[PDB]
């Protein structure tokens, strides 16, 4: 802004598509048909949980004027031990997790959240997504360090073959280790802005995955 | 061009809508319910006929290196006396013309095409759109003169209350005389480029009207 | 109907628009130019606040297998006295409220939330949207009793001239009293499902208003 | 189902994407980097030429109440010896042909149009798309006999490695011989209806290829 009051449009613009490799959960499942159980991984924030409520509360509580809350151990303790009660599970994640359970895959969560003394996020995820004990693995809190992709080594260590995530670093962590990185759309009401350019590495992007 | 190989997208962009007053034929009909017969008008090119085939042929035949064909009387003779055999009627126009016939409206066509000694466009339109004799009026060839909207005076003269068209000058001709100007989308494969910004005057734009 | 693995698409579908009266905040502002200060009203949930985090926590806490939480005063006491710390303010609301405050309009909030003994929602709204105390009015907790219109009487009582809301009942409540009902899009990750058909009464719908 | 006067919409629908493998010409070019000159093939109608003007004239002239014109040699003689002067070349085809000529690829056209005693279509294509005589090959008129695949044998004969087309049979013809079938969108104002479901076999579809 400012911008024209009545900008109008045209049918070239209305029909215009970005060249993105869109996929569905069913297409992913089909692409894996006949493949034995393997390790797969999920990002948490804006991938399986709309957790902006806790991040928003955290900023207001711990650093209303800056971004310091993200490096505040007190914030992470709150975030990892109860504030996910307000996090809303994503339907795309329900469908993916169900599919990987059907396959007998081992399911990992690899998050940029900082590790804390205790955490109840693993419980929240297993409960909300109805993940059986055998498929479930305790959440890996990889942390966040500018200049380093903290997730890549975890994907290698756990032999993760597919990694789902909303951020560029989720996709490149997969690329770093030769895994299949698949993009989930970050919701437009997320407080984590700007939204990433889903498909910017030529990766598969799941349709309708903002909710 | 050039532009990024993998530009990606995000869900804000995917869901983004231009602020346009979109309408359907049914909504227009409803808005006129109970109103007695009146005069209404249609633009021809890219409004009721995809006539690019004749314009394309005309440019190649009469001015392959310039835009002079548009002021060439020989071109207009060909265009108005047979080349509309290759023009493709628009479905939106079939629906609008049917609706105005239901209403008992007088139907006019007001085109920027130049007048010629003879014309068979009136026949083409009445035949293709199944317009009864009573509703049909001979095409008004208003011509094109830079700096002047040649259509406005015709809308006034014929007491035209609604004017349908694809070009900015169709909408402003209606505005000039206090008529209701309603926009039809120009097809993206039209040779008349650039496409106009439908809705740029805050006018109603008919959905799906490119075909 | 079969839902194919590879459904494909076509350019008619890609370009297809629903016939909706889309508007922008700037267009609304323009439509009010020169009009003196008036009373305007807002729905709360999915109109100005993404409050699904608290409603989600409420469902899980108070009625995991039913909708009984929505009639449980213990839930409402939590929801109205602190759980909005986890609600995410909507950008469309920031823009509308700023615009109306700039106009000198009186700002009302009329919600279907159940009334409670105390409420901190009024403070949350005034603080987050930077609403001066003069323009601000205490939230009107109209309640929600299906088969009953509980907002219209309040719109009439406060002479509210424009009412913004996401639900069908918000629009018809406005229409029933002769107010201008303007629709805001409910986010697709709201837990209040199904999503309403914005524009279902021919009302104005604000573009990009899901966030 | 009732088709409401005011159907409305919701943001799930607004953001909804079909799971299609969209590609750009630049991405196709990138995928071929370093690969030596090869034979590539194009369908004609609605792939490189918007030829509906002639097919429309043909239907009206030769079989206004049936599809018999499509099997009438008198129609084909007209269609293949001058009516393409009214066909509108597609921009997507200009870009693809330029790209393949730049690569040093051999260019073939394999059409389901019926063969005629003479044809000027090869010249029309070479002239309009600026195809050097070396890269150019005379159009292969494979014909169209429903229940029969008439293009696959030609793709094999000419060792065509990539085949571009708008119809389902174009894609499956390519797949049947192990060639890369790439879909172009049929324009919504084509008279060949219904429009195909581009992407219905999981094939690549070129973005914005309706014009
Ligand atoms: N502005 C922001 N709002 C909300 N969450 C953020 C923001 N920046 C980073 N995060 C999230 O918090 C963690 C630490 O930066 C990351 O894993 C990231 O997903
Ligand atoms: N570049 C163009 N291609 C096709 N038709 C055109 C072009 N410019 C103008 N026209 C049409 O030809 C007429 C004379 O300019 C106008 O009524 C207009 O609709
Ligand atoms: N599942 C839900 N999620 C969020 N808000 C709801 C839900 N059901 C009802 N509401 C809102 O709460 C109020 C009381 O039910 C209503 O006015 C409605 O707008
Ligand atoms: N109605 C039509 N309009 C345009 N092209 C058609 C139509 N029907 C068939 N064709 C094309 O002409 C050929 C012979 O029918 C086919 O290969 C097909 O692609
Ligand atoms: Mg994330
Ligand atoms: Mg026109
Ligand atoms: Mg609401
Ligand atoms: Mg074809």
Q: What is the DSSP string of chain D?
A: ----SS--B-HHHHH-----EEE-HHHHHHHTTTPPP-EEEE--BTTTEE-HHHHHHHHHHH-TTSSGGGG-HHHHHHHHTTGGGG-EE-HHHHHHHHHHHHHT-EEEEEE-SPP-SS--HHHHHHHHTT--TTTB---EE----TT---SHHHHHHTTEEEEEESSHHHHHHHHHTT-EEEE-PPPTT-SS-SPP-BTTTS-EEETTTT-
- Assess C33–B contact: CB distance below 8 Å, yes or no: no
The two structure tokens encoding residue C175: 């229409």
CA distance to A3, A49, B178, B196, D16, per residue, from B19 (Å):
12, 32, 23, 16, 19
List, in sequence order, every residue forming a beta bridge with D163; answer none if it has no partner.
D41, D181
**Residues linked to residue D180 through DSSP beta bridges, in sequence order:** D162
Closest listed residue to residue C141, CA positions, set C109, C170, C171: C109
**CA B9 to CA B144: how far, in whole Å?**
42
Total Cβ atoms within 10 A of residue D98? 14
Q: Do D22 and A22 touch (CB under 8 A)?
A: yes
The answer to whether A183 and A203 are in contact (CB under 8 A) is: yes
Cα D97–chain centre separation = 13
Q: How far apart are CA A15 and CA B93, in angstroms?
A: 21
- Per-residue tokens: C86: 């986890």
List the end-to-end C-alpha distance of chain A, in Å, as a whole number: 28
Cα(D26)–Cα(D39) distance, rounded to whole angstroms? 19
**Residue D164: count of CB within 10 angstroms of its CB:** 29
Q: Which segments of B are annotated as binding site for Mg(2+)?
A: 43, 45, 166
A157 contact partners, CB below 8 Å, separation of at least 6: none
User: C126 in helix, strand or coil?
Assistant: helix
Ligand 3 atom 15, closest CA = C70
CA gap C93, C109 in Å, rounded: 12
Rounded to 5 degrees, φ, ψ at D43 are: -65, 160
Q: Are strands D49-50 and D88-89 parallel, antiparallel or unpaired?
A: antiparallel
Are the beta carbons of C25 and C182 closer than 8 angstroms?
no
Is some CB atom of chain D closer than 8 A to the CB atom of A30? no
Q: Are B22 and C22 in contact (CB under 8 A)?
A: yes
The tokens describing C89, both together, are 């303010």
**How far are the Cα atoms of A203, B152, D157 from residue A174, in angstroms, in the given order?**
10, 63, 42
Q: Please judge whether B4 and A200 are an interchain contact, meaning their C-beta atoms are less than 8 angstroms apart.
A: yes
Number of H helices, E strands in chain A: 8, 9
Q: Is the CB of B75 under 6 A from ligand 2?
A: no
Feature table: binding site of B for substrate? 111-112, 151
Residue of A10, A17, A24 best to disrupt the D interface, most CBs of D under 10 A: A17
Q: What is the CA radius of gyration of chain D?
A: 18
| SS3 state at A128 | helix
Q: Going by DSSP bridges, is the β-strand pair C160-165/C180-183 parallel, antiparallel, or unpaired?
A: parallel
CA distance D128 to D125: 5
The Å distance, Cα D124 to ligand 8 centre, comes to 16
If DSSP codes are grouped into helix, strand and coil, which group holds residue C107? strand
Q: Check pocket membership of B58 for ligand 2, CB cut-off 6 A.
A: no
Is the domain defined by B1-211 classed in CATH 3.40.50.1000?
A: yes
Residue of B5, B11, B186 for testing the chain A interface, max A β-carbons within 10 Å: B11
Q: Is the CB of A112 under 6 A from ligand 1?
A: yes
C9, containing H or E segment: none
Judge contact between D181 and D163, C-beta under 8 A. yes
Ligand 1 centroid distance, CA of A210 (Å): 17
Contacts of D43 (CB under 8 A, 6+ apart): D109, D110, D111, D112, D163, D164, D165, D166, D167, D170, D184
Strands B180-183 and B160-165: parallel
Chain breaks in chain A (C to N over 2.5 A) after: none
Secondary structure class of B116 (helix, strand, coil):
coil
Q: How far apart are CA D163 and CA D40, in angstroms?
A: 6
Tokens of A30: 């089909």
| Residue C5 three-state SS | coil
Alpha-helical segments (H) within chain C: 11-15, 25-31, 52-62, 73-80, 91-103, 121-128, 152-157, 168-176
Which residue from B46, B67, B71, B192 has its CB within 8 A of the most atoms of ligand 2, so it is best to mutate?
B192
**Cα dist from A69 to A59, A119, A166, C22, whole Å:** 6, 18, 21, 39
Nearest to D210 among A15, A21, A23 (CB): A15
Among C45, C46, C105, C170, the one annotated catalytic: C45
User: What are the two backbone dihedrals, phi and then psi, of residue A13, each rounded to the nearest 5 degrees?
Assistant: -65, -40
How far is D211 from D186, CA to CA, in rounded Å?
9
Cβ contacts of C115 within 8 Å, gap of 6 or more = C76, C141, C143
Ligand 2 atom closest to residue B193's alpha carbon, by position in its atom list: 1
Phi, psi of C84 (to 5 degrees): -70, -5
Between the alpha carbon of residue C204 and those of residues B211, C162, C171, the distances in Å are: 26, 11, 10
* Ligand 4 touching residue D113 (CB < 6 A): yes
Question: What's the gap in Å between D77 CA and the centre of ligand 4?
Answer: 15
Task: Return the axis-axis angle of helices D73-80 and D52-62, rounded to nearest 10°.
Answer: 150
Q: Which atom of ligand 2 is nearest to the CA of B113?
A: 17
A52-62 and A73-80 helices cross at what angle (nearest 10)? 150
The angle at the Cα of D189, spanning D187 to D192, to the nearest 5 degrees, equals: 80
**Protein residue closest via CA to atom 14 of ligand 3:** C113
Token pair listed for A143? 């942390």
Positive or negative CA dihedral for D60, D61, D67, D73? negative
Cα–Cα–Cα angle for C91, A51, A111, nearest 5°? 130
CB atoms inside a 10 Å sphere around CB C29: 16
Min Cα distance C4 → chain B (Å) is 23
Q: Could you give the CA distance from residue D56 to residue D78 in angstroms, rounded to a whole number?
A: 12
Q: If we measure between CA atoms, which residue out of D81, D86, D97 comes closest to residue D48?
A: D97
D92, D195, D110: which is closest to D158 by C-alpha? D110
Nearest Cα residue to A162 out of A173, A153, A148, A149: A173
- CA D167 to chain CA mean position, Å: 7
CA distance D83 to D55: 9
For CA atoms B103, B108, B111, B116, the dihedral sign is: positive
φ/ψ (deg, to 5) at A17: -120, 135
The residues pairing with C160 across neighbouring beta strands, listed in sequence order, are C39
Q: Is A58 annotated as a binding residue?
A: no
Q: Are A89 and A49 in contact (CB under 8 A)?
A: yes
Task: Please give the resolution of this entry in Å, rounded to 1 decimal.
Answer: 1.2
Q: Check CB contact of B50 with chain D, cutoff 8 Å.
A: yes
Alpha-carbon distances of A10 from A25, A66, B50, B99, C206, rounded to whole Å: 33, 42, 16, 25, 20
Distance of CA B38 to the CA centre of its chain: 19
d(CA D15, CA A195): 15
Centre of ligand 4 from the C-alpha of residue D23, in Å: 26
Angle between helices C52-62 and C73-80 (to 10 degrees): 150
SS3 A121: helix
Task: State if residue A49 touches ligand 1 by the CB under 6 angstroms criterion.
Answer: no
> Residue C171: CB partners within 8 Å, gap ≥ 6?
C163, C165, C181, C183, C200, C201, C203
What is the Å distance from ligand 5's center to A194 Cα?
Answer: 13
Query: What letter would DSSP give residue B163?
Result: E
Q: Are C124 and C154 in contact (CB under 8 A)?
A: no
Which ligand is nearest the CA of D151, by number?
4
Q: What angle do CA B77, D46, B183 make, to 5 degrees?
A: 60
Sign of the alpha-carbon torsion through D110, D112, D117, D118: negative
- Give the pair of three-digit tokens for residue D69: 């014109």
Phi, psi angles (nearest 5°) of residue D93: -70, -40
C154-158: Cβ within 8 A, 24+ apart = C154/C41, C154/C108, C154/C110, C155/C41, C155/C110, C155/C179, C158/C39, C158/C41, C158/C106, C158/C108
Helix (H) / strand (E) containing A153:
helix A152-157
CA-based torsion, A16, A22, A25, A30: positive or negative: positive
Query: How many angstroms is it from C198 CA to the middle of ligand 7?
Result: 12
Q: Radius of gyration over alpha carbons of chain A, in Å?
A: 18
Q: Which ligand is nearest to the CA of A42?
A: 5
Nearest to C210 by CA among B49, D164, B14: B14
Answer whether A63 contacts ligand 1 (Cβ < 6 A): no
* C-alpha separations of D191 from B21, B87, B167, D57 in Å: 29, 11, 24, 11
Please tell me which of the candidates A27, A60, A189 has its beta carbon nearest to residue C189.
A189
d(CA C131, CA C135): 7
Please name the residue that has the structure tokens 């005629």: D116
Assess A1–B contact: CB distance below 8 Å, yes or no: no
C-beta separation of C138 from C107 below 8 A: no
* CB within 8 Å: B20 and C24: no
How many Cβ atoms sit within 10 Å of the Cβ of residue A119?
19
| Distance between CA atoms of residues B73 and D192, nearest Å | 34
The tokens describing A208, both together, are 């309708």
Q: Say yes or no for a CB contact (<8 Å) between B88 and D56.
A: yes
Judge whether C45 counts as a catalytic residue.
yes
Q: Is B144 in the pocket of ligand 2 (CB under 6 A)?
A: yes
Write the DSSP symbol of residue A22.
E
- Residue contacts between A and D (CB atoms, under 8 Å): 40
Question: B45 has which bridge partners?
Answer: B49
What does the block give as tokens for C46?
A: 């999915």
Question: Is some CB atom of chain D closer than 8 A to the CB atom of B15?
Answer: yes
> Any residues with CB less than 8 A from the CB of A141 and at least 6 apart, and which?
A80, A111, A113, A114, A115, A116, A119
CA distance B17 to D13: 12
Strand, coil or helix: C41: strand
CB of D187 within 8 Å of a chain C CB? The answer is: yes
For chains A and B, what is the number of CB pairs under 8 angstroms?
Answer: 84
Tokens of B210: 């490119």
The ligand 3 atom at the shortest distance from the C-alpha of residue C114 is 14
Report residues near ion ligand 7: CB below 5 Å.
C 43, 45-47, 166-167
Q: Is D109 in the pocket of ligand 4 (CB under 6 A)?
A: no
Smallest Cβ distance to D198: which of C8, C20, C198? C8
DSSP H or E run through C42:
strand C39-42
Chain C, 101-140: which have a CB under 8 Å from a chain D CB? none
- Assess contact for B171 and B203: CB atoms under 8 A: yes
Ligand 4 proximity of D52 Cβ (cutoff 6 Å): yes
CB A85 within 8 A of CB A52: no
Cβ-based neighbour number of residue C122 at 10 Å: 17
Query: Could you tell me the two tokens for A104?
Result: 């007998």
């Amino acid at each position: 802004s400012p911008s024209p009051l009545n900008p109008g449009t045209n049918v070239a613009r209305l029909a215009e598509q970005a060249p993105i490799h869109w996929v569905s959960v069913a297409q992913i499942e089909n692409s894996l048909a006949g493949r034995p159980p393997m390790a797969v991984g999920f990002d948490i924030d804006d991938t399986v949980l709309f957790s902006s409520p806790g991040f928003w509360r955290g900023k207001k509580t711990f650093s209303p004027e800056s971004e310091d809350y993200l490096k505040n151990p007190v914030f992470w303790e709150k975030m990892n031990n109860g504030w996910d009660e307000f996090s809303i599970p994503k339907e795309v994640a329900r469908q993916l997790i169900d599919m990987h359970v059907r396959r007998g895959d081992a399911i990992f969560f690899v998050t940029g959240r900082s590790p804390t003394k205790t955490e109840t996020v693993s419980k929240t995820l297993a409960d909300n997504f109805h993940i059986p004990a055998t498929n479930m693995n305790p959440v890996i809190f990889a942390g966040d360090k500018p200049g380093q992709n903290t997730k890549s080594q975890w994907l290698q260590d756990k032999n993760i073959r597919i990694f789902y995530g909303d951020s560029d670093n989720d996709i490149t962590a997969a690329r770093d280790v030769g895994a299949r990185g698949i993009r989930i759309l970050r919701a437009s009401n997320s407080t984590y802005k700007p939204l990433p350019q889903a498909g910017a590495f030529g990766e598969e992007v799941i349709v309708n995955s903002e909710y």
